[PDB]
C-alpha cells in the first residue's frame, strides 16, 4: 500500500522560474482591506502607450529639437534610429520597459509638440526609411520613403507612426555589440519650408519630442538587461 | 495625425491613421504584471555564525554576509554595521566608498532588478523565499521568520543547548540531513498593517515628532529572517519571488546613462 | 484672443475660477475623490463643510528666460494649505488627527502670441519633497535624476528619492504651452498606503511645476511671467478630533 | 491575469493556506457577530416577580 | 488691446474683520478669477449677506 | 504524428507551459483589442453645452 515511485534524474534541482508554488507556512492570515485603492494597472502595455521624452543632443540631452528659419534639404533636424536601443530613447518608459523583454512587434509613435510662438508658421517633412540602402542624406531621398508633412497652425502637436516593416514577425529588442547601418531604419525630421515670422518674434522655436507604443505594439519573453549604474 | 498633447492625453494609433497600412496585432501574455514579477531574483549572500545551532543568537556578518535579512526588495544593510542588526536604507552602497573604489558588486542587500524596474508607487503581493547554500555537501540551516512589526531580538536563549532562534511558536524552519537537497523554500503571507506598500519612496516620517527622515514607511516589509546552522563557512543566496503582484499608480523608473559613445547600446 | 468651448468656469463655495483658453480637466487615474468615510475609523467623520470645499489661490513663482529644462517647483499637499492661507480648511485640519481628501487644481500663467515656451504641470503621489513639506522657494534641478545619496556613498548607484524626469509624463499632467493655453486643470482622487492619512507626518501628494521648453521672446515683450495656482480640497473627510496641532509651522 | 503557475493539479494546500485572505472593509462599519462562542458566566435572579411578596415596602 | 492677456481676482468681503489688506486675505472671502480672452467683460455679483432682511440705503 | 512520449497521466504542467504556443498570423493583419486593461487618465470638460451661456461671443 505505500506507492512505488521512480525518482527522476533531475531530483533536487531548483528552477528560478518554475511554473509552480511552494510550501505555505503561515496560513489563514487575513489581510488589511485595500479596497479604497485606485490607479491599478495590470499589463505594462496599458501604460507603454503614454509618451515620454526623447533625449536630443546626447549626452547633454534636452527634450526637444530646434526649428530654424532655414530649410537646408541637406540637413535633418533630427535622425533617430528605429531601435529600442537608440541612445536617443534610453530614458523613455518605452525603452525602459522594452529592455526587460527579448522581442517586440508593432507600431512606434513619435510625437512632436510645437512650442514656438503663435505667430510662427512652418512645415516639416517627417520620414521613416526602411533599411537596405542606408540612411537618406537629403530630404529629397527621405521623401522617397514613408513620410508625412506637418503644417503648423492651431493644433500644437503631430503624432507620426512608424509602420512595422519587417521580414520577421518580431524584431529583437536590444543590440548585442552595436547594429551598424542596420537597426531597422531611420526616422528623419526635415524642414520643408522655413519657420517664418513677423517682426517682434523670435526666429527659432523648440519642438518637444516624445515616443510611445502604438495600439499594435507587443513585447515578449521577459529577461533582464545587462545591469547598470545610473552614475 | 494632428494632435494636441497639452491635454495630458494623446490618442493612440497604428500605421493605419496616416498611411495605407494594416494593424499587426498578435497576442501575448508575458507583459502582465503578475507574470512579470512571478519569478525569483536574488537579494544577496548571507551567513550563519559558528555554533549558532546551540546558543544565543547575535547579529553578525561574515563578509558583509550577515545573519538575518529583512524581507523587502529595497536596500538594506549598510556595510558600516555589518555587525549590527541590519536596517532598511534609502540608498544603495557601492562596493567601495572612495573614487578609486568600484560600484559593483554592491555591498547593501536588495533586489537590484526590482529597484532598476518598478514603475509603480504602491504594490501588494505574497513573498516566496528560496535559501540556496553555496555547497553541494551536507548543510544544516535553522530559520526563524518573524512577521513585520513583531519581536525581532531573538537574543535570549531560553532552553539549555537549544538555539535561541528555535524558541516559541514563531515560525521556524529547519533542514539538515545527509539526504536533503540542501535548499529551503516557503511562502509567507502579507503582514504589513499597511493596505498597500510604498515601492520606491514614502514621503513621510516615522513619528509625529517629524524627526525628519523621510523615505520609508514603517512596517512596510514582509518581516525578518534569522539564520543559525552548521556550516559557518558556507554562504547561501536568498531569493525573493512576488506571488500575485498588484501595482498602483505608474511612476518613472531608474535613469539610464547617455551613451557618450554611439546611437545605441547593447549589454554590460 | 481665447475662445468658445475653451471658455470655462468652476464654482467651489464662494469661489469660482474662469479661463478663456482651457484644454479640459485631466482627471488622474480616471476617478474622483468620493468623500466616503475611512473604514478604519470608528468615529463619525466631520464632512461636507462648505467653508472648506473651495479654491485657495496664491502665487507660485516667476517664470523667466533663465529657467532651464526640468527645473521645478514642488507644492506639498495638504501641507501648503495647513496654515493661515488654508482658511477653515487649515483650521479644521489642525484639530484632526486624520484627513482623507482628493485635490482639484488650476495653475495659471499668461504671456502673449509673441512669447514661446512651455511648462509641464503634474501631480504625483509620494513625490519626494522637502523634509518640512514646504513649497519650494526657487526653481531647482536638485537631486535629479538619481536621488540624494550620502556624502561618503561615493560609489552608490542611486537613492530611493530618485526621479528620472525624462518620464515625468507618467504622472497625471497637462502642458502649459504659451501658444496654446493659459491655464491647466487637474484633479486627483485619494490614494495612500492606508484608508485615511495622518497628514501631520506625510505629504502624500505633490503638485509639481517644471520648465520643459524655456521662455523665449523678443524685446518689448513681457519679460517675467508670474505663475499662480488655485487649489481646492475635494470632499475632505476629517476624523480624530483633538486639541490644536499648534505649531502650525 | 495570473502569474507563472501552470500546474493541472488542484493545489494540494487550500487557498486560505496557500494565499493571504483578501478582505474588504465597508465604509460604514460592520457589526461584530453577537457571540464569539458559547462560553459564558450567567447572572441569575437579576430582577423580581415572585416571593413572599407584597408584605415588602412601597 | 486684443494682444494683451491677464487675470484679475475680484472679491467681496463681508464686514466683521475689517477690509482685507492683500489679495491673500481677499481670497479668503467670496471671489471670482476673471481671465482675459475673447469675451470683453465680466459681471461680478455681490451676494446679499446680512443679518437683517433689509439694509439701510443711506 | 507524435514523438516518443507514452505516459497515461495527463501532463502535470498545462500545455501553455509545457509547450511553446503556436500562433497563426493572418495576411491582412489583426486589430488590437480596444483596451489593454482598465487603467486610464481621463479628460473631462473637453467640449461644451451648458454654462452662463450665450452672453459668450459669436
Class derived from helix and strand content of chain C: mainly beta
What's the oligomerization state? part of a larger assembly
Order of helices and strands of chain C: EEEEEEHEEEEEE
By CATH, the architecture of chain D is named: Irregular
Kindly report the CATH topology of chain D: Foot-And-Mouth Disease Virus, subunit 4
Reading off the top of the CATH hierarchy, the class of chain D is best stated as Few Secondary Structures
> SSE string of chain D, helix = H, strand = E?
H
Question: Do you know the CATH topology of chain C?
Answer: Jelly Rolls
Q: For the CA atoms, what is the radius of gyration of chain C?
A: 19 Å
Number of strands of chain C: 12
Give the percentage of residues in beta strands of chain C: 35-45%
Number of helices of chain C: 1
The helix-and-strand class of chain D reads little secondary structure
* Number of structural domains of chain D: 1
Percent of residues in helices of chain C comes to under 10%
Instruction: Assess the beta-strand content of chain D as a share of residues.
Output: under 5%
Number of domains of chain C: 1
Shape field of chain D: rod-shaped
Helix content of chain D: under 10%
Terminal CA distance of chain C reads 43 Å
Subcellular location (chain E): Virion; Host cytoplasm
Protein name (chain E): Capsid protein VP3
Organism (chain E): Mengo encephalomyocarditis virus
Amino acid at each position: 500500500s505505500p506507492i512505488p515511485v521512480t525518482i527522476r534524474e533531475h531530483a533536487g534541482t531548483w528552477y528560478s522560474t518554475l511554473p509552480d508554488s511552494t510550501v505555505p507556512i503561515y496560513g489563514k492570515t487575513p489581510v488589511a482591506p485595500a479596497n479604497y485603492m485606485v490607479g491599478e494597472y495590470k499589463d505594462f502595455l496599458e501604460i507603454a502607450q503614454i509618451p515620454t521624452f526623447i533625449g536630443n543632443k546626447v549626452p547633454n540631452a534636452v527634450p526637444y529639437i530646434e526649428a530654424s528659419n532655414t530649410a537646408v534639404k541637406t540637413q535633418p533636424l533630427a535622425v533617430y534610429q528605429v531601435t529600442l536601443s537608440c541612445s536617443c530613447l534610453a530614458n523613455t518608459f518605452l525603452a525602459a520597459l522594452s529592455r526587460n523583454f527579448a522581442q517586440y512587434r508593432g507600431s512606434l509613435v513619435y510625437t512632436f509638440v510645437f512650442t514656438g510662438t503663435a505667430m510662427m508658421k512652418g512645415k516639416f517633412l517627417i520620414a521613416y526609411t526602411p533599411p537596405g540602402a542606408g540612411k537618406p542624406t537629403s530630404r529629397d531621398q527621405a521623401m522617397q520613403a514613408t513620410y508625412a508633412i506637418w503644417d503648423l497652425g492651431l493644433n500644437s502637436s503631430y503624432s507620426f507612426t512608424v509602420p512595422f516593416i519587417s521580414p520577421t514577425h518580431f524584431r529583437m529588442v536590444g543590440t548585442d555589440q552595436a547594429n551598424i547601418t542596420n537597426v531597422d531604419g531611420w526616422v528623419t525630421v526635415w524642414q520643408l519650408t522655413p519657420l517664418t515670422y513677423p517682426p517682434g518674434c523670435p526666429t527659432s522655436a523648440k519642438i518637444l519630442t516624445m515616443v510611445s507604443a502604438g495600439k499594435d505594439f507587443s513585447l515578449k519573453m521577459p529577461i533582464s538587461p545587462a545591469p547598470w549604474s545610473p552614475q | 495625425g494632428v494632435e494636441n498633447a497639452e491635454k495630458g492625453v494623446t490618442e493612440n494609433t497604428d500605421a493605419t491613421a496616416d498611411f495605407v497600412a494594416q494593424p499587426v496585432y498578435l497576442p501575448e501574455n508575458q507583459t502582465k504584471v503578475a507574470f512579470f514579477y512571478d519569478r525569483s531574483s536574488p537579494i544577496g549572500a548571507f551567513a550563519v555564525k559558528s555554533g549558532s545551532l546551540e546558543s544565543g543568537f547575535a547579529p553578525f556578518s561574515n563578509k558583509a554576509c550577515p545573519n538575518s535579512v529583512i524581507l523587502t526588495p529595497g536596500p538594506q544593510f549598510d556595510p558600516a554595521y555589518d555587525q549590527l542588526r541590519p536596517q532598511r536604507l534609502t540608498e544603495i552602497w557601492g562596493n567601495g566608498n572612495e573614487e578609486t573604489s568600484e560600484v559593483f558588486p554592491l555591498k547593501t542587500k536588495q533586489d537590484y532588478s526590482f529597484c532598476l524596474f518598478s514603475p509603480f508607487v504602491y504594490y501588494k503581493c505574497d513573498l516566496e523565499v528560496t535559501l540556496s547554500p553555496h555547497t553541494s555537501g551536507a548543510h544544516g540551516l535553522l530559520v526563524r521568520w518573524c512577521p513585520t512589526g513583531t519581536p525581532t531580538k531573538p537574543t535570549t536563549q531560553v532552553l539549555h543547548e537549544v538555539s535561541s532562534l528555535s524558541e516559541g511558536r514563531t515560525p521556524q524552519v529547519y533542514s539538515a540531513g545527509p539526504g536533503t537537497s540542501n535548499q529551503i523554500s516557503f511562502v509567507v503571507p502579507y503582514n504589513s498593517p499597511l493596505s498597500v506598500l510604498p515601492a520606491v519612496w514614502y514621503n513621510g516620517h516615522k513619528r509625529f515628532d517629524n524627526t525628519g527622515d523621510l523615505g520609508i514607511a514603517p512596517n512596510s516589509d514582509f518581516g525578518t529572517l534569522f539564520f543559525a546552522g552548521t556550516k559557518p563557512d558556507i554562504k547561501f543566496t536568498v531569493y525573493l519571488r512576488y506571488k500575485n503582484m498588484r501595482v498602483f499608480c505608474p511612476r518613472p523608473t531608474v535613469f539610464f546613462p547617455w551613451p557618450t559613445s554611439g546611437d545605441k547600446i547593447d549589454m554590460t | 484672443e481665447n475662445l468658445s468651448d475653451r471658455v470655462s468656469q468652476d464654482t467651489a463655495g464662494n469661489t469660482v475660477t474662469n479661463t478663456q483658453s482651457t484644454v479640459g480637466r485631466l482627471v488622474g487615474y480616471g476617478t474622483v475623490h468620493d468623500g466616503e468615510h475611512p473604514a478604519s475609523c470608528a468615529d463619525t467623520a466631520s464632512e461636507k463643510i462648505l467653508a472648506v470645499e473651495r479654491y485657495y489661490t496664491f502665487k507660485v513663482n516667476d517664470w523667466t528666460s533663465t529657467q532651464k529644462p526640468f527645473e521645478y517647483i514642488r507644492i506639498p499637499l495638504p501641507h501648503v494649505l495647513s496654515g493661515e492661507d488654508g482658511g477653515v480648511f487649515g483650521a479644521t485640519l489642525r484639530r484632526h488627527y486624520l484627513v482623507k481628501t482628493g485635490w482639484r487644481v488650476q495653475v495659471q500663467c499668461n504671456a502673449s502670441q509673441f512669447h514661446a515656451g512651455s511648462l509641464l504641470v503634474f501631480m504625483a503621489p509620494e513625490y519626494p519633497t522637502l523634509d518640512v513639506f514646504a513649497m519650494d522657494n526657487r526653481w531647482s534641478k536638485d537631486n535629479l535624476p538619481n536621488g540624494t545619496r550620502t556624502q561618503t556613498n561615493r560609489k552608490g548607484p542611486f537613492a530611493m528619492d530618485h526621479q528620472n524626469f525624462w518620464q515625468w509624463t507618467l504622472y497625471p499632467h497637462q502642458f502649459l504651452n504659451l501658444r496654446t493655453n493659459t491655464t491647466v486643470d487637474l484633479e486627483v482622487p485619494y490614494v495612500n498606503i492606508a484608508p485615511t492619512s495622518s497628514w501631520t507626518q506625510h505629504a502624500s501628494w505633490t503638485l509639481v511645476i517644471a520648465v520643459v521648453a524655456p521662455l523665449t521672446y523678443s524685446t518689448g515683450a513681457s519679460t517675467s511671467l508670474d505663475i499662480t495656482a488655485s487649489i481646492q480640497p475635494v470632499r475632505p473627510v476629517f476624523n480624530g478630533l483633538r486639541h490644536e496641532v499648534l505649531s502650525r509651522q | 491575469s495570473e502569474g507563472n503557475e501552470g500546474v493541472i493539479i488542484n493545489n494540494f494546500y487550500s487557498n486560505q493556506y496557500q494565499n493571504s485572505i483578501d478582505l474588504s472593509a465597508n465604509a460604514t462599519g460592520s457589526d461584530p457577530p453577537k457571540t464569539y462562542g458559547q462560553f459564558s458566566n450567567l447572572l441569575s435572579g437579576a430582577v423580581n416577580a415572585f416571593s413572599n411578596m407584597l408584605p415588602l415596602l412601597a
